[PDB]
């Protein structure tokens, strides 16, 4: 089997991407944030504290003939951005782009943090990291991809995120029309539960490539590119007037600037992030100070190849017995 679904930016800045997901019978379609940095499929629901729901579409398990309470199971997650959610668990039929999993753990939120409430466009998350990170207790649950894997034509999914445009998540096949040149594959460590890999270096604009190992995670659920302070300083040093602002919470730059590209290495291959992808617009409405899309990972504890990086590539998440990651230009 295979699946193919379009993923759409939630706003004009590509702050996140939502993908429609069918849950239950009859189908209830929710727009979920596909997140290769976590491993829970959780949704706003009929059980979510009413004051914490603000415009989201909810899953109502009582209206699904295939929903079953997973007795005794609870979940609770905190994300790297400080947001969180928790609740109980149902199993139900879940389909993505034509690919159907029966008995998928659907984690129903009883509580969500304000960040989730305040974002009307995201109805929940669909985790695509390794199932070892799943938070369901006392019986850990498998991700959608893990459940689908054996049935897929090939045990892979691909992320093809657009810049200020829709893109595609495919399951079970590699669309050879969706990228240019060849796909370069690189080793993955699953030790921390993430799609963790090592970039071979970077360049700023038309500058020379610096060969240096940068361990980080491929994370579709993180907006920006978080890299070591040395790398980030080298980038912003090429933008007149750019500075790290403790009050804003990162590098800002004059909105009048033209940003240089940023290149990262995948083995001997190179992925070029155009300068425009690194512009996240005014820090507040009407400001002439703009927020940068490349930020320091210092104090995160890990480097994160988030959407800024991934949307410059066609990315293969290869879930074979020994997982790997593939990157192609597009």
């Amino acid at each position: 089997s295979t699946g193919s679904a379009t993923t759409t930016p939630i706003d004009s800045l590509d702050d996140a991407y939502i993908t429609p997901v069918q849950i239950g019978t009859p189908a209830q379609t929710l727009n979920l944030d596909f997140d290769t940095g976590s491993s829970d499929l959780w949704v706003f629901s009929s059980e979510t504290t009413a004051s914490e729901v603000d415009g989201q579409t909810i899953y109502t398990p009582s209206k699904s003939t295939t929903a079953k309470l997973l007795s005794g199971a609870t979940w609770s997650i905190s994300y790297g951005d400080g947001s969180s959610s928790s609740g109980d668990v149902y199993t139900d039929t879940v389909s993505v782009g034509g690919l159907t999993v029966t008995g998928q753990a659907v984690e129903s939120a009883k509580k969500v943090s304000s960040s989730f409430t305040e974002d009307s466009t995201i109805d929940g998350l669909l985790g695509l990291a390794f199932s070892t990170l799943n938070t369901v207790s006392p019986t850990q649950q498998k991700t959608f991809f893990d459940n689908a894997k054996a049935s897929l034509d090939s045990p892979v999914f691909t992320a093809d995120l657009g810049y200020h445009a829709p893109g595609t998540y495919n399951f079970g096949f590699i669309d050879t029309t969706a990228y240019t040149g060849s796909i370069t594959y690189t080793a993955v460590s699953t030790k921390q539960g993430f799609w963790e890999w090592t970039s071979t270096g970077y360049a700023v604009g038309s500058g020379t490539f610096k060969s240096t190992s940068i361990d980080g995670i491929a994370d579709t659920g993180t907006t920006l590119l978080y890299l070591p302070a040395t790398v980030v300083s080298a980038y912003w040093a090429q933008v007149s007037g750019a500075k790290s602002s403790s009050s804003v919470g990162g590098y800002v730059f004059p909105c009048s600037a033209t940003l240089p590209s940023f290149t990262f290495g995948v083995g001997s291959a190179r992925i070029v992030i155009p300068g425009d992808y690194i512009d996240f617009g005014p820090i507040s409405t009407g400001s002439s100070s703009c927020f940068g899309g490349i930020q320091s990972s210092a104090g995160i504890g890990i480097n994160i190849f988030g959407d800024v990086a991934l949307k410059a590539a066609f990315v293969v998440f290869n879930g074979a017995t020994t997982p790997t990651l593939g990157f192609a230009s597009k």
Side-chain angles (χ1 to χ4, degrees), residues 248-275:
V248 175
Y251 280 90
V252 298
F253 68 94
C255 293
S256 60
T258 297
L259 298 177
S261 63
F262 184 89
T263 300
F264 64 93
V266 182
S268 56
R270 306 290 180 253
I271 299 293
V272 181
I273 305 171

Short mmCIF file of all heavy atoms in Angstrom, two decimals, residues 248-275:
data_model
loop_
_atom_site.label_atom_id
_atom_site.label_comp_id
_atom_site.label_asym_id
_atom_site.label_seq_id
_atom_site.Cartn_x
_atom_site.Cartn_y
_atom_site.Cartn_z
N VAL A 248 14.29 39.77 22.43
CA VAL A 248 13.41 39.15 21.44
C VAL A 248 13.51 37.62 21.52
O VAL A 248 12.52 36.92 21.32
CB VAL A 248 13.72 39.66 20.03
CG1 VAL A 248 12.88 38.93 18.99
CG2 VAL A 248 13.48 41.17 19.95
N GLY A 249 14.71 37.11 21.81
CA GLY A 249 14.90 35.68 21.93
C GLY A 249 15.65 35.04 20.78
O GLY A 249 15.49 33.85 20.50
N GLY A 250 16.49 35.81 20.10
CA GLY A 250 17.32 35.27 19.05
C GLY A 250 17.83 36.36 18.13
O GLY A 250 17.73 37.55 18.42
N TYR A 251 18.40 35.93 17.02
CA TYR A 251 18.88 36.83 16.00
C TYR A 251 17.74 37.52 15.28
O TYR A 251 16.77 36.89 14.84
CB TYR A 251 19.74 36.06 14.99
CG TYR A 251 21.13 35.82 15.48
CD1 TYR A 251 21.45 34.67 16.20
CD2 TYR A 251 22.15 36.73 15.22
CE1 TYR A 251 22.73 34.45 16.65
CE2 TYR A 251 23.45 36.51 15.68
CZ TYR A 251 23.73 35.37 16.39
OH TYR A 251 25.02 35.14 16.83
N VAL A 252 17.91 38.83 15.17
CA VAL A 252 17.03 39.68 14.40
C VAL A 252 17.87 40.42 13.38
O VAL A 252 19.08 40.51 13.52
CB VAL A 252 16.27 40.66 15.31
CG1 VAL A 252 15.38 39.90 16.28
CG2 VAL A 252 17.24 41.58 16.04
N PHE A 253 17.22 40.94 12.35
CA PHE A 253 17.94 41.62 11.29
C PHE A 253 17.03 42.69 10.69
O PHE A 253 15.82 42.61 10.80
CB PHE A 253 18.42 40.62 10.23
CG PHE A 253 17.30 40.00 9.44
CD1 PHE A 253 16.92 40.54 8.24
CD2 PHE A 253 16.62 38.89 9.92
CE1 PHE A 253 15.88 39.99 7.51
CE2 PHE A 253 15.58 38.34 9.21
CZ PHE A 253 15.21 38.90 8.01
N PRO A 254 17.63 43.71 10.06
CA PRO A 254 16.79 44.75 9.46
C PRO A 254 15.93 44.17 8.35
O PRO A 254 16.43 43.47 7.47
CB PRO A 254 17.82 45.72 8.88
CG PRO A 254 19.08 45.46 9.64
CD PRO A 254 19.06 44.01 9.95
N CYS A 255 14.64 44.48 8.37
CA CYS A 255 13.76 43.92 7.37
C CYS A 255 14.14 44.38 5.95
O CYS A 255 13.75 43.75 4.98
CB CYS A 255 12.31 44.28 7.67
SG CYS A 255 11.64 43.51 9.19
N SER A 256 14.93 45.44 5.85
CA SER A 256 15.44 45.92 4.57
C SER A 256 16.58 45.08 3.98
O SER A 256 17.02 45.33 2.86
CB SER A 256 15.89 47.38 4.68
OG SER A 256 16.93 47.55 5.64
N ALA A 257 17.08 44.11 4.73
CA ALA A 257 18.21 43.32 4.28
C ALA A 257 17.84 42.32 3.20
O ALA A 257 16.70 41.85 3.12
CB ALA A 257 18.82 42.57 5.44
N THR A 258 18.84 41.98 2.39
CA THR A 258 18.76 40.83 1.51
C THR A 258 19.59 39.73 2.16
O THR A 258 20.79 39.88 2.36
CB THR A 258 19.34 41.15 0.12
OG1 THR A 258 18.57 42.19 -0.49
CG2 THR A 258 19.32 39.92 -0.78
N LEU A 259 18.95 38.62 2.51
CA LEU A 259 19.63 37.55 3.22
C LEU A 259 20.41 36.64 2.29
O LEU A 259 19.94 36.29 1.22
CB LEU A 259 18.63 36.69 4.00
CG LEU A 259 17.85 37.42 5.08
CD1 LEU A 259 16.85 36.45 5.71
CD2 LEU A 259 18.76 38.01 6.16
N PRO A 260 21.62 36.23 2.70
CA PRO A 260 22.36 35.21 1.95
C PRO A 260 21.76 33.83 2.14
O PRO A 260 21.06 33.55 3.10
CB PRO A 260 23.76 35.28 2.56
CG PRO A 260 23.55 35.75 3.93
CD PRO A 260 22.35 36.65 3.91
N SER A 261 22.05 32.96 1.19
CA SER A 261 21.67 31.57 1.31
C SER A 261 22.50 30.88 2.39
O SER A 261 23.49 31.43 2.87
CB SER A 261 21.86 30.85 -0.02
OG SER A 261 23.22 30.85 -0.39
N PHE A 262 22.06 29.68 2.78
CA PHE A 262 22.80 28.85 3.70
C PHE A 262 22.81 27.45 3.12
O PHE A 262 21.76 26.90 2.79
CB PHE A 262 22.15 28.83 5.08
CG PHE A 262 22.93 28.04 6.11
CD1 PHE A 262 23.92 28.65 6.87
CD2 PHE A 262 22.69 26.70 6.29
CE1 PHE A 262 24.64 27.93 7.80
CE2 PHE A 262 23.42 25.98 7.22
CZ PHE A 262 24.39 26.61 7.99
N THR A 263 24.00 26.87 3.00
CA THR A 263 24.16 25.53 2.46
C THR A 263 24.52 24.57 3.58
O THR A 263 25.38 24.89 4.42
CB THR A 263 25.28 25.52 1.42
OG1 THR A 263 24.95 26.42 0.36
CG2 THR A 263 25.50 24.15 0.87
N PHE A 264 23.90 23.39 3.61
CA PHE A 264 24.34 22.34 4.52
C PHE A 264 24.73 21.08 3.75
O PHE A 264 24.20 20.80 2.67
CB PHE A 264 23.33 22.05 5.65
CG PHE A 264 22.00 21.50 5.20
CD1 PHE A 264 21.77 20.15 5.14
CD2 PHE A 264 20.94 22.35 4.91
CE1 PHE A 264 20.52 19.64 4.77
CE2 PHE A 264 19.70 21.86 4.55
CZ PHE A 264 19.49 20.51 4.48
N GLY A 265 25.68 20.34 4.29
CA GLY A 265 26.16 19.14 3.64
C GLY A 265 25.44 17.89 4.06
O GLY A 265 25.10 17.70 5.24
N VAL A 266 25.20 17.03 3.07
CA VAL A 266 24.69 15.68 3.29
C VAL A 266 25.68 14.79 2.55
O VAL A 266 25.68 14.75 1.33
CB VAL A 266 23.27 15.51 2.74
CG1 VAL A 266 22.76 14.14 3.03
CG2 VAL A 266 22.32 16.55 3.34
N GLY A 267 26.57 14.15 3.30
CA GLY A 267 27.68 13.45 2.67
C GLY A 267 28.41 14.44 1.78
O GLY A 267 28.69 15.57 2.18
N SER A 268 28.70 14.02 0.55
CA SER A 268 29.37 14.90 -0.40
C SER A 268 28.39 15.84 -1.12
O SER A 268 28.81 16.68 -1.91
CB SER A 268 30.16 14.09 -1.42
OG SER A 268 29.32 13.16 -2.06
N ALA A 269 27.10 15.71 -0.83
CA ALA A 269 26.07 16.52 -1.48
C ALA A 269 25.81 17.79 -0.68
O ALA A 269 26.25 17.93 0.46
CB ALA A 269 24.77 15.73 -1.69
N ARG A 270 25.10 18.72 -1.31
CA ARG A 270 24.87 20.03 -0.71
C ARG A 270 23.42 20.42 -0.93
O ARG A 270 22.90 20.29 -2.03
CB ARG A 270 25.78 21.06 -1.39
CG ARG A 270 27.27 20.70 -1.37
CD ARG A 270 27.85 20.80 0.01
NE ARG A 270 29.29 20.46 0.05
CZ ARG A 270 29.81 19.35 0.57
NH1 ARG A 270 29.03 18.41 1.10
NH2 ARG A 270 31.12 19.17 0.56
N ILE A 271 22.77 20.89 0.14
CA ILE A 271 21.42 21.44 0.06
C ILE A 271 21.51 22.94 0.31
O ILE A 271 22.05 23.36 1.34
CB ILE A 271 20.49 20.77 1.08
CG1 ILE A 271 20.38 19.25 0.82
CG2 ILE A 271 19.13 21.44 1.07
CD1 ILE A 271 19.68 18.86 -0.47
N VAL A 272 20.97 23.72 -0.62
CA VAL A 272 21.01 25.18 -0.52
C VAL A 272 19.67 25.73 -0.07
O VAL A 272 18.65 25.54 -0.74
CB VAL A 272 21.43 25.81 -1.86
CG1 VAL A 272 21.48 27.33 -1.71
CG2 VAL A 272 22.76 25.25 -2.33
N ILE A 273 19.69 26.41 1.07
CA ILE A 273 18.53 27.10 1.59
C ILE A 273 18.59 28.54 1.06
O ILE A 273 19.48 29.31 1.46
CB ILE A 273 18.51 27.13 3.13
CG1 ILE A 273 18.60 25.72 3.70
CG2 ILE A 273 17.27 27.86 3.64
CD1 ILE A 273 18.81 25.71 5.21
N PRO A 274 17.66 28.93 0.18
CA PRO A 274 17.69 30.33 -0.27
C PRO A 274 17.50 31.33 0.87
O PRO A 274 16.81 31.05 1.85
CB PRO A 274 16.52 30.42 -1.25
CG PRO A 274 16.27 29.00 -1.69
CD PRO A 274 16.58 28.17 -0.47
N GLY A 275 18.11 32.50 0.74
CA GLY A 275 18.00 33.53 1.75
C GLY A 275 16.58 33.85 2.16
O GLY A 275 16.32 34.05 3.35
#
